[PDB]
Design an enzyme around this catalytic site. Sequence first.
Site, PDB file in Angstrom:
ATOM      1  N   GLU C 175       0.821  -1.193   0.000  1.00 55.45           N
ATOM      2  CA  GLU C 175       0.000   0.000   0.000  1.00 55.45           C
ATOM      3  C   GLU C 175       0.868   1.261   0.000  1.00 55.45           C
ATOM      4  O   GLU C 175       0.373   2.366  -0.131  1.00 55.45           O
ATOM      5  CB  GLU C 175      -0.995  -0.028   1.166  1.00 55.45           C
ATOM      6  CG  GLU C 175      -0.413  -0.360   2.533  1.00 55.45           C
ATOM      7  CD  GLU C 175      -0.551  -1.832   2.946  1.00 55.45           C
ATOM      8  OE1 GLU C 175       0.075  -2.724   2.307  1.00 55.45           O
ATOM      9  OE2 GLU C 175      -1.256  -2.080   3.956  1.00 55.45           O
ATOM     10  N   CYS C 280      15.943  -7.018  -0.579  1.00 53.35           N
ATOM     11  CA  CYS C 280      16.156  -8.351   0.045  1.00 53.35           C
ATOM     12  C   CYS C 280      17.569  -8.931  -0.268  1.00 53.35           C
ATOM     13  O   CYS C 280      18.104  -9.681   0.544  1.00 53.35           O
ATOM     14  CB  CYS C 280      15.023  -9.345  -0.322  1.00 53.35           C
ATOM     15  SG  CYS C 280      14.413  -9.232  -2.032  1.00 53.35           S
TER      16      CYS C 280
END
Lengths: 487, 488, 488, 489
Positions: C175, C280
Amino acid sequence: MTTIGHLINGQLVTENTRSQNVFNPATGEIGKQLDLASTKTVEQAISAAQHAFPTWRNTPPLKRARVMFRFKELLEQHADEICRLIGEEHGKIAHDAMGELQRGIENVEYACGAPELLKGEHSRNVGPGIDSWSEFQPMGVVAGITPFNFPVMVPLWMFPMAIVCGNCFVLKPSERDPSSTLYIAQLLQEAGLPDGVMNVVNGDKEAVDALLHDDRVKAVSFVGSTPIAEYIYRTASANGKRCQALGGAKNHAIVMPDADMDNAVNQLLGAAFGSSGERCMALSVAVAVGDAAGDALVSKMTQAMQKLKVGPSTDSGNDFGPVITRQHQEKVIGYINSAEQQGATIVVDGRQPKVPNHENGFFVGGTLIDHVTPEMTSYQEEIFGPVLQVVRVATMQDAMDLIDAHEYGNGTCIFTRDGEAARYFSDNIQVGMVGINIPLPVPVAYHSFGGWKRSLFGDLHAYGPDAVRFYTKRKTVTQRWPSAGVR
Amino acid sequence: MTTIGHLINGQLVTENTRSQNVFNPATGEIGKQLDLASTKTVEQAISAAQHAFPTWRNTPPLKRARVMFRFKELLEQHADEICRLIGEEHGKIAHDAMGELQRGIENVEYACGAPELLKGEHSRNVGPGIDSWSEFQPMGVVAGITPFNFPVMVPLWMFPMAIVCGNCFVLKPSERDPSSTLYIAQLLQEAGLPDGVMNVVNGDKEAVDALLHDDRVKAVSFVGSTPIAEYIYRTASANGKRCQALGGAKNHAIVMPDADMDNAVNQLLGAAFGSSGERCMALSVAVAVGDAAGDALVSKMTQAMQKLKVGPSTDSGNDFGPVITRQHQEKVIGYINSAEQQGATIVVDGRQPKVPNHENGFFVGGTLIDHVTPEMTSYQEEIFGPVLQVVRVATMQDAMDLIDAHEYGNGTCIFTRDGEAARYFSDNIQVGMVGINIPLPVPVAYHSFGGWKRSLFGDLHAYGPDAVRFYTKRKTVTQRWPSAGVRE
Amino acid sequence: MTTIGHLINGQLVTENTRSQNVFNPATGEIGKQLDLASTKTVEQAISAAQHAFPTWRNTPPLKRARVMFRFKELLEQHADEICRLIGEEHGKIAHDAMGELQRGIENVEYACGAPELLKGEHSRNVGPGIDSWSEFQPMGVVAGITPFNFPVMVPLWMFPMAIVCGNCFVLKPSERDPSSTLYIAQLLQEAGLPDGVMNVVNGDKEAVDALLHDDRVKAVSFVGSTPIAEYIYRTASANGKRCQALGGAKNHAIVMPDADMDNAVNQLLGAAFGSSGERCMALSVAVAVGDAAGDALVSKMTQAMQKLKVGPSTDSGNDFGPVITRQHQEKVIGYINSAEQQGATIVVDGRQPKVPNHENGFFVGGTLIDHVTPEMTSYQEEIFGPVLQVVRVATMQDAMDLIDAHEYGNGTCIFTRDGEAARYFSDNIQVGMVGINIPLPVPVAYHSFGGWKRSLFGDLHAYGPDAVRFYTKRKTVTQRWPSAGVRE
Amino acid sequence: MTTIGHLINGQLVTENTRSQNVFNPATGEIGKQLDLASTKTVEQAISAAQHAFPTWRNTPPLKRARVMFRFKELLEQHADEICRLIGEEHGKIAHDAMGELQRGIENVEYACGAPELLKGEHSRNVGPGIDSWSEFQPMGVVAGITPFNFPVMVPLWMFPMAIVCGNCFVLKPSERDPSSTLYIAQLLQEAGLPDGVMNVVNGDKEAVDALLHDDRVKAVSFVGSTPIAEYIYRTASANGKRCQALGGAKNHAIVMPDADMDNAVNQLLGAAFGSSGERCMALSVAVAVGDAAGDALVSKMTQAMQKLKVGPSTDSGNDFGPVITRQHQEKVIGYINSAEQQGATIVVDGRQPKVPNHENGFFVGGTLIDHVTPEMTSYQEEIFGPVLQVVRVATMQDAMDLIDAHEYGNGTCIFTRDGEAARYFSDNIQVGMVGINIPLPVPVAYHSFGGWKRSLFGDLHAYGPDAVRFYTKRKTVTQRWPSAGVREG
Ligand SMILES: NC(=O)c1ccc[n+]([C@@H]2O[C@H](COP(=O)([O-])OP(=O)(O)OC[C@H]3O[C@@H](n4cnc5c(N)ncnc54)[C@H](O)[C@@H]3O)[C@@H](O)[C@H]2O)c1
Ligand SMILES: NC(=O)c1ccc[n+]([C@@H]2O[C@H](COP(=O)([O-])OP(=O)(O)OC[C@H]3O[C@@H](n4cnc5c(N)ncnc54)[C@H](O)[C@@H]3O)[C@@H](O)[C@H]2O)c1
C-alpha cells in the site's frame, strides 16, 4: 589348450573354420586359440537377437532393469576372476583391472535406473482437447564393436544401456583379449537375461563387416582408433543405419606457473603411464607454460619416474604391465626413436626396459621426452604407450592454440589454482572432456563420454544420457477423442 | 524480369553466371529469374558465417533469444505479404500459407526459450570434492537445405533454433519458390541479428555440394525426398560432419468400423487434398477395415469431394492451388494413369481438372482411387499430389501389417472410439508420428518431428528438443581444487 | 484528490469505506489516496477469479503463453511511464526502476515458454500393457502478496508464471506504492487476457486475512519481512492451503586477501547502496578476512563513495532515492546511531544527508560503518537502508562461521581469485543464493530465487522452475485397456 | 514377553519408563511390549542423526546409493521373515505382505539412482562471462512418521530417498506393528550405512511432538489420517520447518455401461477387500452409472464374494486378514450398522464373520452395501475395513460431481472401453491419482504418490521425484572471475 568360442542365444558355439592366437603379453607366449566368426556365424547372432527382440521390447523397463541389478552383484562376486582374465591377455595389473571393472559396474548401476531414463515428455492441450507425448522406443538389434585396452569397461558402456532400453545386442570385442569380455557376457545369463538378448561374436574385420551390412542391425556403436572409427562411421552411414564411432586421442595438460607441481606430477604418473599408456584418456603431452615450470616439471617427474615398477600382472605392486602385442611394442619403440631423431631429449629412456626377469614379452618402460615440437611425427601421432612428452610455451593462450590445432580433441586438463584461467580454459578449449586439476577427466556413468573433432564421429556420445537417445528412437503421439457418445 | 539473389552478410548480392526460371504455377508463366550460386558464392556465405560466429557464440542466450522475440512480431506483422509470396511461387492459397507461417512462428516462439533449453546438467561430488557438469556449446557454421512444399515453415524448423543455440547459418532453399524464404531471412536483420549470422544462398545441386564439401560447415540439416536425403546423409557422413536428413512419405489412416465416418471423411479432405497434397504428412492412403466401412468411405468421400474448389491463390475460398511445376503435374497424372491401368477404380477423376478459367497452369483436381493393392506402383511410391487411395482389408492387424511393410514410416492415423485399439496402434505401429483421430499428427514446436524407416536418416529429429541437441555439442567438465592454501 | 482503485474482473472499481495516504517520499507530501479493500471487495475479486478459471484452465498453454508474449511488448512500450510511477511512490531513480522492470520482463519471457515447462513425464509399460504419466494441472485461484521495494518485479515473479500455468490470480500489493503495480496489471487486458483471470485488490491486513481464509484460494505466494512471512505461512498452513513465504536478510560478502579490491569495491557500491539498500539482496555486511584487506576495502570504499549522489527521481544521475517512509527513515537513522553508541566507527556519515534541496522527505545518505562486531544489534537485525558495515575476522572459516550463525540466509558472496576457496565457500555456506565475485547473485528468470533458514518458509522457491511446481498440482494417471474386442 | 526397543546410533536401546501392548490381531492376544520413547530419548536419536550428518552430507551420491543397492538385496534375502513380522502384528497374509515389501523395494531401486536424480541445472553465460547453476543439497536431520497399515512400504517411501539425498533420518512408526519396521532398519547397518544416519524411535504423540519441536529437525514426512496429518502439517509449519502430510481417502470407481463387468468385479475384489480394506488406496465406493450396470455389478460381485476367505496369516491362501485392533473392529462394524440404519441394503454381511476357527481376534468379513447415498455417515467417512459401497447415478457427470464433492480426493478409477470418456474423466476429475480400468492406480517408485483436497497437505508429494525435491534444498550459485592476471602471460 582349448578354444574360445561365441556366445549366441545363451550358448557357447564355435565355427571352426579359422582361428588366431591370443597371447600372454607378459611372457610373449601363446595362451589360447580364438575362433574367428565368418559372416554366417555373425548372422546366427543377429537372428538370435532379432528373434529375442519382440518379447524383450515389451518387457517392462523395471523388469529389464532388475537383470542389471543382479548383473551388478555377479560382476562384484567374480571380480578377482574377471581381473585375472583381463590381466592374462591385456597384461594390466590387478589395480588397473579393478579400476576398469569398477567403472564398468558404474555403467551397470546407471542402467538399473532405466525407468527414470526412459520417461517421455507428456503435453496437455497442444490444441483444445488434444494431447501429445513422446516415447523413446527400442531400435531392435544393436551392434557393438570394442577395442583391446578396456575389454570389460568399454563393452559395459554399450550393452547394459542398450539392453535395458529394450534392444538386443551383438558384441564384437577385440580379438587380442576376448576371455574377460566373454566371461562377463556369460554372467548375464545367470542374472536372468533371456537367451538371445545379449550375444558375443569374436573375429576380425570379417565379423565387423557382416554387422555393418546386415539390414536387421539398426545401430552401430564403435570405440577404437580414428582410421577405423571413420571407416565404421562412413560405411554404417552409407547403408542408412545410425552410428557413433569414437576415435583416438592426444591428450594435453597445461601446467601453469601457479599450479601445485607436486600434485601435478603425482597425478601425471597415473594418467600418463597407467595401463601402460594404452588409454584413450592417456595424458601423453604436458604443455609447460614458462620454464620456470618446464624445468621443475621435468625435474620432479624424472625423480618420481625412478620409483615406477614395470612387470607382469602376476606381481601386484607393479605400476603397469606390458604393451598388447609385439607389433605394438615395435611401434611404440619406433615413436621414441623418431622423437630422439627429430631432436627431442629422451630424459628417461624406457626403450630397453629389460626390467623383467624371465620375460621377453612386450614390455616398454616409462619414458619422458622433453623439448618436443609440433613438427614432430611422434607429437602429431597417438603413441598409445607409456610415454609422456613435454612442450614448452611462453603463454597459456599458446598452449591452448597448440591444443586446438591438433587433429584430436578427446580429453584435456589444466593444472592451476586460479578460477579465471580455469573457466576461460573450460569454456574456450576445443575438446569434449575437460579437466581442472584432473588429468583423466573421464565422465562418470551418469554423464556421457565423447571427444570433439576427429576423436568422435556422430552427434550422440557414449554411455550416460546420450546412450539412451542413441539406443532408442523418438515416436510422438498426438491424441484426440472427438466422438463423445458414451460420455 | 527481376533476378533473385542471395542474402550474404546482410546484403543482397548476385553472381549472374547462371540462372533458372521461377514460375507462377497458377498461370504457368515465368515470373522471375533465380540466380544460382556456384561454389565460390557459397564459400562467401560460409566465410561470412564463420566470420560472425566467434562473437555470436559468446553472446548470452537471453540476448540471442530476444532477436527471436522481435522476429516473432516481424513475422506476424508481415504475414499477408509472406503469404502472397508463398502463394505467388508455390501456388498455395492464403489459408494454407497462413497455416504454414503460423507453425513457423511457433518454432520461433519455442526458440525464444533458449536459456531454458540450453541448460546443462550439474553434478555435485562425482568423486569426493569433485564436481562435474555438461555444456551444450555451439557447432559453428550450420547448413540447412529445405524443400519447395514449405518454403517458410521448414526453414523455420532449422535456423531459429540453430541461431539461438549460438550457431551461424547458411540456408539453401528450394529453387522453385525462393521469394518467401528470402523475405523472412531479411526480416531477421530488422529483428536485430548481426550481419552474417544468417545467410541464404540460392542454387541447385552445385550449391548443396559446396556446403557438404566445406570443412567449416559442421552440421547439415536436410529436409526433402528420400533419394536425396539418402545422398545428403551418406555424403555428409563421408565428410565427417554430423547430419539429419528427412525423407518422403506414404501416410496411411486406418478407418475402423466404430469411427464416426463423417468426422473421418471431413478430416480426410484437408489431409488428402490440402496444399494440393504436396505435403510430407499428407494423408494419401485410407485403409478401411471391413466394407462395411470401405463402401461408406468411398460413398461419403465422393459427395464431400464435389464441393472442392481448385484454383489460383488470387481467389481465396479455393480449397487448394496448383501443383509446383509442369514436370510434377505430368508425374501426378502419370501415377493416376498407372493406377487405372493396374486395375484401380478411379472414382473421382481430376486428371483433366480444367476447372480454371484462364489458367493452363499446373492444376490437378482432387482424385479418388478405390481398390488399390500393395502391388501397384502408385501405392508403393509417393505421389505427392491431390490424390487419395483407398485400400480394403479384413482386420485392423492387416492394415497395420500393410503400413509396417511400407518403405516409408513418416506419419499415420487411426480413426476410432475405442481406447484399447488406439494404444495397441500407437505403441506397435512402426511410424514416427502417430495420430488418434488426428490425420496430420504433426508435432508442436516444443516436440520434434521425424519419421522412421526410410523417412529419416539419423538419430536426432527435426526442430524442438532434438534440434537443440543437434545444433550444439556436448562438453563435460570435471573440476577439482587440490590446494587450500588461500583458505588457510 | 485522486483515489487509487482495484482491478476486479477487468474493471477499475473502488469501495470508498476506508483509505490510506500514498506519499511522494522525495517531497514528503501526500500524493494520492489508496482505497483499502474489505473482506467483501476481496471476495468479489476471488469470485471473479473463480468464475474465469474453468475456461482458462482448459485453454491450451500455447494460447495462454501468447498473452505473455504481448504483455512483454507492452511492458517495454510503457517502460518510461512505469519507471515514473515506481519512482513517484517508492522514490527510486530511473535506472533502478528500469532494472526492476527488466528483471520483471525476464520473468514474463520465461513464462512465454510455458508449454515446455508444463511437460509431464510419460512412462511406457509400468507393468505389462499398462502406461502411466504425470500431469501438472492448475490449482485454481491463487493469491499473491508483495512488498514495497519492488512493486513491479516481485509481482512479476508471481502472476506471469501463475496465470500461464492455468490459474487465476488475486494480487494484494504494498500500500506504500500501488500505482505502478496496478498500471501493469491493466496492460494485461490489452494483451488479450480474459477478464477475471488477473485481479489486483489493494488493502491492508484485512485484505490479506480475507485471502488467507477464503477456501477458494488455493495457494499463497508472499514476499516481504520475516515476521509477516512467518504469520502468512502459519496462517495459510493452518487453513490447509500450500504456501511460499520469503522473508528478510543480512547478506554478507567475504573479501579475501587475493580479491581484486578495485572490482569488489565498485560492485559493492551498487549492491550496498543501490535502490537505497531497500533490497532483500542488498549487501549490507562486508566481512574482511585480515586487515590487510579490511583497511584496503574501507579505504577504497570511502573514496568511491564520495562521488555518490542522493536525491529525487526527477533528477536522473542520482545514484539512489529516498527511503520509503518517515518511520523507516527514523528506523535507519536509529540503526546507525546504535552502531556508534555500541562502539563502531562511522567512517562515512549520511544520517544528516541534507543533500536536497527542496526535500524534507525521507532521505538517508550512503553510510559506511567500520569495526562492527557480532554482539551489536545493528549487525543482528536487517537495516534495509544504504548502510555498509565492515566486520574484520582472522580467517575465511571465521567469516563463514559468522555467516552460518546468522538468523537469515538469503544471499551471500565471496570475492576471490582462487577456485578452491570459491568451491569450498559455494558448497558449504548455509545460504540459498551464493555469488562468486558477484555481490548480487540474483538468479535469472530461468532459475528460482529463495533463501535458506529464516529467510524463507516452504519448499518451493520463487519464480523460475520451482514456480511451475508451486502453481500446479501433480496428477498421476495409470491407464489399462483390458478388452480388445473392436480391434479384433 | 520380549520388549521392543529403539535403534539409535546403530544400537538397540530401551528407555523403560512406559510401554504398550502390541497384539496378534488374529488371536486377539498380547504378543509383545513396545517401549515408548520420551522426549529425552527422541533427542538422543536426533543428536545421533545430527552428529552423523556432516560426513554423510559430503559423501558422494554414488557411495550413498551403493548402500541402497546392498539394502535391495537384504530385503529380498529376508523377505519371508519380514512378511512374517508384518503378518504377526498387522495380520496381513503372505501375498499382501510380499506385495507391500515388493513396492518398498521398488522405492529402494529408485533411490539407487540418486546421482541422476540429484542433477542440478547449469547455465552458461547468464550474463557476459557469468555462469550460474543449481544444486540440491541436503536438509539435515529429517523426520518420518508412518501408519500401521504399511509398516514396511510407507517407511520405504521416506528414508531410502531421504538418506541417499545426503540426510540423516529419525523414524517414528506405528506403535501397533513396530517389529517389521525395526527389522528392516537394522538391515541397513549391514548394508553399510554409518551409525546414526538412520534411527527408529518408537512411541506415541509424545515422540511425535519431540520431533516437531526440536529445531534440528528440518523436514517432516507424515503419512496417516487426515485429522493427524492436519495437526502435523500445522504444527510443523508453526515451527518453521517444511512438511508433507498425507491423509485419508474415499476412493470411487465409476462403472460405465460399456465397461467389461467381469474384469471390473474381478479387479474390485482385490481393491476393495485386499489388506482387509485397510489401505489409503482401497476402492470403497463403486459409482454405477445406470442400473443396468448397478444391478449387474451387484449381481456378479455377490457371486465372486462368496469365494473370499477370511482368516489368520498362518493359513496362506486366505484372501485377507483381521483388522488391526478391537477398537477398529468395533468402528468398522459400527459403520455397517450405521449404513443399515440409514436405509442401505446389506447385500453381503460380514459383521459376524465367525469364519475362524479358534479366533476371537479382530476379524471382519468382506461386506457389500447397496443403495448408499451421499447423506449417509458411512459414505462421508472413511471406514477403512473390508467394505464395498455402491452408489447408483443417472449419468457420468453425476458420478464425477459426486466424487469432486467429497472431502477426500486421494485416488479414483473409471471402468470403460471408450477413449473420450477416459480422457474427460482423467483430465477433469479432482483427485491426485487416476486410474483407467485400474482400481488401484498406485504410482510406481519412479513417480510420486499424493492425493488432492484434504487427502494431502503440502506441495510436494510422497516418494519418487518429488521426494528428491522435498528431501533437498535448492542452492543457486552465480560465478564470475573478473581478474585475468594469471592467464596473461
Ligand atoms: N575415444 C575413445 O572413446 C576411446 C577410448 C578407449 C580406447 N580407444 C581406442 O582404442 C584403440 C586401441 O584398440 P584396438 O587397437 O583394438 O582399436 P582398433 O582401432 O583396432 O579398433 C577396435 C576394433 O575394431 C576392429 N578392427 C580393427 N581393424 C579393422 C579394420 N581394418 N576393419 C574393420 N574393423 C577393424 C577390431 O577387430 C576391434 O574389435 C586406440 O587407438 C584408442 O584410440 C578409444
Ligand atoms: N498416503 C495416504 O494418503 C495414506 C496411505 C496409507 C494410509 N493412510 C492413512 O493411515 C491411517 C491409518 O493408520 P493410523 O491409524 O496408524 O494413522 P494415524 O493418522 O493415527 O497416524 C499414524 C502415525 O501418527 C502417529 N499419531 C497417532 N495419533 C497421533 C496424535 N494425536 N498426535 C501425534 N501423532 C499421532 C502414530 O504414532 C503413527 O506413527 C488411515 O486413516 C489412512 O487414511 C494414508
